[PDB]
């Protein structure tokens, strides 16, 4: 594992002295030219450790480098030393002093070592072309060729065309002859390599016999022995999709193959991962919206949300082909979002940096009024799934779950008929109509709302909220604006008490209701009753200590005289504000006092009579005042600056262009 001796060896390899390095190079010189025995390996290992574990370059004495290169060029060296030297020259790269050559060793395994040495350089000196040409020339004779095929594959990975058309067709015919048994001799030995890079070969780059044997060999990796079977099904489907891409007629063939597979692929547990490539093939060439795509979107995540790699595959298919999404597919992915949220509840770390892209890609017209609640009840979704695991598992296999926390109260509450329908809505696979507040279920799930997984899911809700709002703040109309305002006014203090959750939803929702109000100034005007009740309640400032500032500031500023406004609304709002200020003066913070002073004094300078009311009451509040200092000082800006009416009439209702940095330098050009 991790021994302090290992750490000491690494530290010594990193911080070897320059003089000690020169001495070691001299020892290598006197020890490699000599009879290379066990001392050879016992020094080469230390050389590899001291070169590998150093990020900064280690250009030691040249003699060692030429000795290593020549040893690679020296055929009498054993396999161990040759491999270690090849690693030496494939790790010390890239150097501009490449004294090596591409035709210096006849042995095919040594040729592989030389290729590994060469390819780790880069195109700084036209190297890759030279290595590819040399490999082709060395393979031009009888080959075998099986050992060097991986070098070919990696080269085409890094260089797509340098394999000339004649060379490319030579490789094609070689692979076709090399196709042929199956997993379920030298011939099969080359068959394994032929299968092991088929998809990359097709992507980067007899033929009747090829269609007869090798073209069906893609499915023969699966169709034409348990874990490798799973590892090979995905390869078969991916190769089929590659054939669809390179051949349009193969799309129908692969679709038919998937439809035939749907007999078991949709009914064989432990094989659910093979549908993700099937879903990708259907998207690039749409599957069953009810059965196949239905399971992919909402069926799978409600049964197998505890596999951290399956969830990555599903959501990555969702976010990697959103560009090629269709209208029906858009409706489907817009339908099952509460179930897709199960993965974010269970497998958040590898899927949230992915929902951040997905969320603006399934926004509908009216789902926002429920989607905000779906985002709001996500930690409770995780807790409900945890209870679902605890109450359905045979004790033998139960390791694939969490049954290691406070069971009894929550399990009893699961069977309590008081909560037999709300859980069936939180854990729902669909959202086709808004549900009730999760306060009862929140009191149910007190014991578990501090799980590790629930705490995981709680940290991906703020960013998803920001994505959703930024996708709707630019896609909103009047009904949506009013609905969202009411939604926040409700959910202000109606959240699941998962630690450090409401402190973030509060911030996002408040600072984005600000964004809505700046999108439409008349929000405070059309929202007389709700805002009036909210400000008039002390409990609003006693439980929403950081959202109250926003609403009182908006009311104080957006009571603007300049067609649904009436003169008495200002007086009614002033009555609510006066009552709140009298009553008030987590309780109201030193911010609510100053914002209340601001709202009162800036709302009574739009009313002719209310200026004397200020002089009687807001002047009294200043005098009593004469974060407390800010409370005392703030009101001056509409007591002293509203005593004079002409100046105060216009500043508090400024035009549309006080923000841009050049809109007024000409307005003092009238003298």
């Amino acid at each position: 594992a991790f021994s302090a001796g290992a750490e000491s060896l690494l530290h010594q390899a990193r911080e070897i002295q320059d003089e000690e390095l020169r001495r070691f190079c001299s020892r290598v010189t006197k020890l490699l030219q000599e009879a290379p025995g066990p001392a050879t390996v016992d020094a080469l290992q230390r050389l590899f450790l001291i070169v590998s574990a150093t990020k900064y370059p280690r250009r030691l004495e040249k003699m060692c480098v030429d000795l290593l290169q020549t040893t690679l060029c020296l055929p009498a060296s054993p396999e161990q030393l040759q491999v270690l030297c090849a690693a030496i020259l494939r790790e010390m790269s890239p150097f501009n002093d490449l004294a090596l050559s591409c035709d210096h060793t006849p042995n095919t395994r040594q040729l592989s070592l030389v290729a590994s040495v060469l390819l780790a350089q880069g195109d700084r000196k036209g190297e890759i072309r030279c290595v590819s040409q040399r490999i082709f020339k060395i393979l031009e004779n009888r080959q075998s060729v099986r050992p060097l095929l991986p070098i070919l594959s990696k080269v085409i990975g890094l260089a797509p065309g340098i394999l000339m058309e004649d060379q490319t067709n030579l490789l094609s015919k070689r692979l076709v002859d090399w196709l042929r048994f199956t997993v379920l001799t030298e011939d099969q030995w080359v068959n394994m390599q032929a299968f092991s890079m088929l998809r990359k070969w097709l992507l980067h780059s007899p033929r009747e016999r090829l269609r007869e044997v090798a073209f069906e060999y893609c499915q023969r990796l699966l169709e034409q022995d348990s874990d490798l079977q799973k590892a090979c099904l995905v390869e078969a489907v991916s190769v089929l999709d590659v054939l669809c891409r390179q051949d349009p007629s193969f799309l129908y063939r692969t679709l038919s193959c998937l439809k035939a597979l749907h007999r078991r692929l949709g009914e064989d547990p432990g094989s659910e991962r093979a549908l993700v490539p099937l879903a990708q093939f259907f998207l690039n060439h749409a599957m069953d919206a009810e059965a196949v795509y239905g399971q992919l979107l909402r069926g799978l995540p409600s049964e197998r949300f505890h596999s951290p790699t399956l969830a990555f595959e599903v959501i990555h298919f969702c976010t990697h082909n959103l560009a090629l999404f269709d209208s029906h597919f858009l409706s489907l992915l817009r339908l099952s979002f509460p179930s897709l949220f199960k993965f974010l509840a269970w497998n958040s770390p590898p899927l949230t940096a992915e929902f951040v892209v997905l969320l603006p890609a399934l926004v509908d017209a009216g789902t926002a009024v429920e989607m905000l609640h779906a985002l709001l009840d996500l930690p409770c979704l995780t807790a409900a799934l945890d209870l679902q695991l605890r109450s359905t598992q045979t004790p033998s296999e139960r390791l694939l779950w969490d049954i290691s926390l406070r069971v009894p109260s929550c399990l009893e509450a699961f069977q309590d008929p008081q909560f037999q329908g709300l859980f069936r809505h939180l854990l729902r696979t669909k959202a086709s109509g808004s549900t009730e507040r999760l306060t009862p279920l929140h009191q149910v799930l007190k014991p578990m709302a501090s799980c590790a997984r629930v705490t995981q899911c709680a940290e991906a809700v703020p960013v998803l909220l920001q994505a959703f709002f930024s996708a709707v703040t630019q896609t909103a109309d009047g009904a949506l604006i009013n609905q969202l305002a009411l939604l926040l006014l409700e959910r202000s203090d109606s959240l699941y008490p998962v630690p450090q959750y409401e402190a973030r939803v509060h911030g996002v929702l408040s600072s984005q209701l600000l964004v809505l109000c700046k999108l439409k100034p008349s929000l405070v005007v059309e929202l007389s009753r709700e805002l009036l009740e909210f400000v008039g309640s002390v409990s609003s400032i006693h439980s929403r200590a950081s959202v109250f500032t926003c609403v009182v500031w908006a009311i104080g500023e957006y009571l603007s005289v300049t067609k649904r406004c009436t003169a008495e609304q200002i007086n009614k709002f002033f009555e609510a504000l006066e009552a709140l200020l009298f009553e008030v003066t987590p309780c109201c913070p030193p911010e609510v006092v100053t914002a209340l002073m601001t709202t009162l004094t800036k709302l009574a300078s739009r009313s002719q009579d209310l200026i004397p009311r200020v002089s009687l009451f807001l002047s009294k509040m200043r005098t009593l005042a004469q974060g407390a200092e800010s409370i005392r000082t703030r009101a001056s800006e509409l007591l002293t600056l509203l005593k004079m009416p002409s100046v105060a009439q216009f500043v508090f209702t400024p035009p549309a262009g006080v923000c841009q940095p050049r809109y007024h330098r000409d307005t003092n050009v009238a003298l």
Binding site: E637, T640, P654
Partner: protein
């Protein structure tokens, strides 16, 4: 103003900045305040900052502040601080020198 303004002690810097700002060293103070604008997430610092701007107001500095106050009003977090900046920017931009001391 020597520090760029990325510290966590900004809530303690802005208090001195407000208690000392005048019309002597303009550009350095404006640069420091502009840098600090991005490091204000809580209401306390967002009021110390406009305390600085009000101190400049009282001092009488005119040019460039039409942009410092503008940027503060346009790029803060709490609405109350932004409205504070709007009012004080209007007061400096539209008042003669004595009337600001008599009507602000």
């Amino acid at each position: 103003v020597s520090r760029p303004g990325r510290d966590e002690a900004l809530c303690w810097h802005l208090q001195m900045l407000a208690k000392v700002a005048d019309g002597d060293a303009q550009s350095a103070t404006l640069n420091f305040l502009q840098a600090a604008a991005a490091h204000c997430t809580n209401w306390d610092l967002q009021q110390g900052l406009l305390r600085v701007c009000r101190a400049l107001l009282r001092a009488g500095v005119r040019g460039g502040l039409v942009d410092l106050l503008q940027v503060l009003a346009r790029q803060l977090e709490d609405p109350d601080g932004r409205d504070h900046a709007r009012l004080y920017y209007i007061l400096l931009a539209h008042l003669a020198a004595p009337k600001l001391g008599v009507a602000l």
